[PDB]
Amino acid sequence: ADKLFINALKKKFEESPEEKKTTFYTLGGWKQSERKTEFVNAGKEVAAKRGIPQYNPDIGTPLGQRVLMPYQVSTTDTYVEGDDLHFVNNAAMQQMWDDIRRTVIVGLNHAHAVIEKRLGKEVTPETITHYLETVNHAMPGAAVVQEHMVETHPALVADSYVKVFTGNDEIADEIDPAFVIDINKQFPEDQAETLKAEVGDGIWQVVRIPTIVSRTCDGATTSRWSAMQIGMSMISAYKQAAGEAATGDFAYAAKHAEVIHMGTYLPVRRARGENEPGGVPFGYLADICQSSRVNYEDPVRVSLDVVATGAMLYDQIWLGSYMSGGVGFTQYATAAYTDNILDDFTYFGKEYVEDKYGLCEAPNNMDTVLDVATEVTFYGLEQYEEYPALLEDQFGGSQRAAVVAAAAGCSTAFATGNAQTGLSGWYLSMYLHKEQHSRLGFYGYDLQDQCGASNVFSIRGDEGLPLELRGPNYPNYAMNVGHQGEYAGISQAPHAARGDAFVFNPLVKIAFADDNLVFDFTNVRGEFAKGALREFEPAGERALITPA
């Protein structure tokens, strides 16, 4: 069998992937590209309509002296120019973030206690179902108590709703099934039993507020909007006074005491509230991605679907816009989910571990790290040396470092079943890479990688942390591309090899096992391709309230 990346390379270039020579400068610059051409014409129309110059191919240096490559979206047969994978140009990657930003998990366990102990009323599946009917009217922005209320247009907010889940099957089956995330239907039996044991008799809401509101406002809006309409529905469904002392317990419960944010707030230099990308820990991101419950027989596929989720969110949207902006970081990210390159390196490492130790059977120590991480690193770098077309494809050193190290780190975690030794292998890969080719990444690429080895196993205040708990706000990780999404993969890798149903939080895992989401979290890379082809229909548009 070939390498998984060969077909991609044969489509990009007319030469064989092994040839060291090509010809440049004859391709027409931007005119070689159907997308650049569309951009040139659009820029002329825009400038004429608004009276200010804009896109102009003659500013600065002339693009396209080399081949402007199409990219294969890995695991698909879709080939697109890279501009179609820019988050601005791809409605699927915008909606994936919106679906995370607009989600919060809110318990009903404290609320039900207030009802029984403080108000002295009964809670049954019938009153729960009535509450859920009420809150699904109210949550998109409609009234239940006051006279002369004005309301949101239901069709503008059709994507907002509330569902529940519980580990108790018999309670789950008595609630109206329209409102229930069925753990037994969404997860394979072994995973469902693990998840149901974690949740037990608790009952949890998954709240999704409207995309149009999330885009007008911010991520920290979500838990507040959620709490307001939970509160109104509790007033209505359980016949409180419309504003008595007990009402306040429900607000505190919904806003603080049993709320699970997707991201925690950030310090002042990068000031942001809850539910922004920098607050989402790597373990949550892996659990948001739903590849684990459909692809559980292939831990490589599960781990790399997480890489793709994270590389997009963390490098393209978060680091490439929230934290910088402009043309951004599309290809720093696409390197990890195009052309089946990372897949080839990581399948090689999984097979090496399978044959030598067996998944999860290697000793969890430095000896395993030095073995697996070195072998996979040398495999990856040799592919760039044997195939000049591959090196021209992933032309930036940063790109290559992230892909090789991801394979080494994931592979090491496959062997030990522990994400922390996987992380040690990531950094070792970087050190070997640097010495082999006398280069690594961009000017500031290996800040965290040089600090890396010593902080994998540190226990000091702002150094020590299991990888699953780390995230974009871990100090060493806060600034640079080509790491965060790959770390999410390394977090997933040992748990996919062990067959674990979740990486860090079982409620987060369950909360995204939902067919009413706009973005399909079971097939992240297929969704990126669909968005690239302009075939994705996002929520939150305003066509209905604007002129033809």
Partner: protein
């Protein structure tokens, strides 16, 4: 002394202790017992060894519902607490026989830790207490069981939570009265970001001791904020004395006179009567069947009004044995007194204003919660400069069991560990005695 004022000091049973003490003997800047309380709060940490052990056994670390399968560690921490605590103390202390203190509680389940004062003499703020305590206990646990390099990061997670990915110690198994400096609404607010429930827990629900500790913390914060500087210093000292320290037995007496049958309105009548008799207010003008009162000393009127406010809280919420109405008392005591006298209410309207939002945000959908979760750093209740929150402490102290978010729900670890420190549990005794001991040095 800068002020001519003197006050008679009483104990929590209404007994005289010392007569005619200079006002500044009660000042946070001068009273050594307040200094002891403030430094004790800065340096005292509670460690939950049972919780650390359970988190490691289940790999449940990093926040609510979080778990890392495959990372479980079975260690017998409670069963080896004496040896762990001793190793931790050697790391925490600066020298042998300094003021370091490490005591085990509940058979090794908890640990009271008081970090040496010397560490705060070369510190900018107060986080050295949790951070030094956390790393000493992490290292001591690792050394006690020879935890491997590969596993030790789970012990760190079990102690300090998701920090530093989170800004807070999210999921931590240590606790302090203070919260992290980033959460301050403004510079100088740290002593105000102590939850009312924590104050009630540390004082074991004794109404006058909870009022005193709360007033000490609030008014000491007003010095750090610069609010009690220059023209305002006397107002804040008089508020501390009369509202929080039962100066001249005024609070105690008002409650005695009104406790069997009284209402908020009847406490107001008695207070106005006493203020007139003591010469604090005088009749300034007569309208039709209505006397307009005036005063030559607004700071003293404020202090008298603030003592009645305390008493009214004690009487109204004590009768209901239910804390929730404190927001109503804080509002309508001040609203009623203004139209009873023609004089301004406590803190020149700011208690009334604080009470308006505090009522709304303790009886509505929009936020807040029950009375015990508020504090002087809360956006809802930060506006009055020390004159509202001590009444909330007193009211929660009197609550018989009407709150879902009670001190037992939010502050159990504080109750069990911080109540052990004498100056935290009975601050009124120590502040008054220290004031007598310095009365002739002021």
């Amino acid at each position: 002394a800068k002020f001519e004022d003197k006050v008679d000091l009483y104990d929590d049973r209404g007994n005289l202790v010392e007569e005619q003490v200079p006002l500044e003997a009660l000042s946070p800047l001068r009273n050594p017992a307040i200094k002891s309380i403030v430094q004790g709060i800065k340096r005292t940490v509670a460690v939950n060894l049972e919780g650390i052990e359970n988190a490691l056994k289940t790999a449940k670390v990093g926040g609510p519902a979080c778990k890392i399968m495959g990372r479980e560690l079975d260690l017998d921490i409670v069963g080896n607490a004496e040896s762990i605590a001793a190793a931790a103390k050697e790391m925490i202390q600066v020298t042998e026989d300094d003021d370091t203190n490490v005591e085990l509680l509940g058979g090794g389940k908890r640990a009271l830790v008081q970090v040496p004062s010397a560490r705060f003499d070369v510190a900018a703020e107060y986080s050295a207490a949790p951070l030094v305590t956390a790393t000493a206990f992490v290292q001591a646990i690792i050394n006690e069981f020879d935890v491997s390099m590969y596993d030790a990061n789970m012990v760190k997670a079990a102690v300090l939570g998701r920090y530093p990915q989170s800004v807070e110690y999210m999921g931590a198994n240590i606790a302090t009265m203070l919260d992290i400096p980033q959460k301050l609404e403004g510079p100088g607010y740290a002593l105000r970001n102590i939850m009312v429930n924590h104050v009630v827990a540390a004082t074991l629900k004794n109404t006058l001791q909870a009022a005193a500790l709360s007033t000490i913390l609030e008014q000491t914060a007003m010095f750090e904020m610069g609010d009690a500087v220059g023209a305002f210093e006397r107002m804040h000292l008089l508020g501390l004395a009369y509202q929080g320290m039962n100066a001249d037995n005024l609070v105690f007496d008002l409650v005695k006179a009104n406790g069997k049958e009284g209402t908020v309105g009847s406490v107001i009548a008695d207070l106005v009567e006493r203020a007139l008799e003591d010469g604090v207010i005088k009749v300034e003008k007569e309208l039709t069947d209505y006397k307009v009162y005036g005063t030559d000393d607004l700071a003293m009127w404020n202090a008298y009004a603030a003592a009645g406010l305390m008493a009214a809280t004690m009487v109204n919420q004590g009768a209901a044995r239910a804390a929730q109405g404190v927001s109503s008392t804080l509002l309508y005591y001040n609203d009623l007194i203004e139209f009873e006298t023609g004089l301004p209410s406590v803190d020149f309207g700011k208690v009334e204003g604080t009470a308006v939002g505090f009522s709304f945000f303790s009886h509505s959908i929009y936020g807040g919660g029950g009375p015990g979760i508020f504090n002087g750093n809360h956006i809802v209740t930060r506006h009055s400069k020390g004159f509202a929150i001590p009444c909330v402490a007193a009211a929660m102290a009197l609550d018989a069991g009407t709150q879902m978010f009670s001190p037992e729900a939010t502050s159990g670890l504080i109750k069990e560990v911080f109540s052990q420190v004498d100056e935290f549990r009975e601050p009124l005794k120590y502040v008054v005695e220290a004031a007598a001991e310095i009365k002739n040095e002021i």
